[PDB]
Paper text:
Class A β-lactamases, including KPC-2, hydrolyze the amide bond in β-lactam antibiotics through sequential acylation and deacylation steps. Subsequently, Glu166 activates a catalytic water molecule for attack on the carbonyl carbon of the acyl-enzyme leading to hydrolysis of the ester bond between Ser70 and the drug.
To further investigate the role of Asn170 in penicillin and carbapenem hydrolysis, we determined the X-ray structure of the KPC-2 N170A apoenzyme as well as product complexes with ampicillin and imipenem. The structure of the N170A apoenzyme is very similar to that of the wildtype KPC-2 apoenzyme with the only major difference being the smaller alanine side chain at position 170, which creates a pocket not found in wildtype and thus expands the volume of the active site in this region. Asn170 along with Glu166 coordinates the hydrolytic water molecule critical for the deacylation reaction. Since sharply decreased values of both kcat and KM are consistent with impaired deacylation in the β-lactamase kinetic scheme, we hypothesized that the N170A substitution results in a decreased rate of deacylation of the carbapenem substrates. To test this hypothesis, single turnover kinetics were performed for the N170A enzyme with imipenem, revealing a modest 5-fold decrease in the acylation rate (k2) but a 2800-fold decrease in the deacylation rate (k3) as compared with wildtype KPC-2 such that deacylation is strongly rate limiting for imipenem hydrolysis in the mutant. Based on this evidence, we speculate that the impaired deacylation of imipenem observed with the KPC-2 N170A enzyme is due to the C6-hydroxyethyl side chain occupying the cavity created by the substitution and displacing the catalytic water molecule.
Numbering used by the authors: 25 to 57, 59 to 252, 254 to 295
Write the structure that this text describes.
Amino acid sequence: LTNLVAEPFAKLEQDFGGSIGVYAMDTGSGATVSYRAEERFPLCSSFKGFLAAAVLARSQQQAGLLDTPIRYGKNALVPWSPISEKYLTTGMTVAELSAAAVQYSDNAAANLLLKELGGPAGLTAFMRSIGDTTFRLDRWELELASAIPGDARDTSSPRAVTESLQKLTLGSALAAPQRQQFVDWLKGNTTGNHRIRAAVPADWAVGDKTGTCGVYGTANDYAVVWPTGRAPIVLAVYTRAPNKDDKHSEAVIAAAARLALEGLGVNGQ
């Protein structure tokens, strides 16, 4: 049930000038589409979705964690912190920081939550606890986004991303209220309109988390998609390219998502 119908991913990545990695899972039948799915790609900001899930998991054992007010100084305000910069003089709650990290890819929020979990190793430990042996986070924002060719730091594979996303949004890795909160944060993401969402018809529900490194043509998106009348689809699309100055492409991510849905036989656009 893997790649029952071949799709022209190779042509797509050649036109892009780099590598595209795709893993898509039909959670009804278990059928999959897979292209470079076990290669490592930089997570970039896409780690922030798993970060929020790790916070939610901790909130199962610490009641009131999400309501905790967090104060921070100007030195916490990393570039691209569009929400946390507006609350510098007031602070934000853990839940607000988590929503900002997921929905606006807020870097200061992400680093504040990373510190709450014990740093990159703490997030990595959470991923190990759900059975993901591929994920590794090694650094903080923005150093984690160097996207160096061949560097395994701050990477995962499209397959491991999809498998973990399925466990967290649809499976049993989170308790039911925390699972729906994670889904609701992903549904409210504002940064992904030109990526997987551009391949998903307007009448289907969808949540996603993007990542964009800014170098080495490196960008990505993962999503859970609910086509009407059938089981949800989980998918991950990651890209990279050989040269530091190579540009990423949102259109290539959307096109790869379209091919994945076509390969799964999901009638879409």
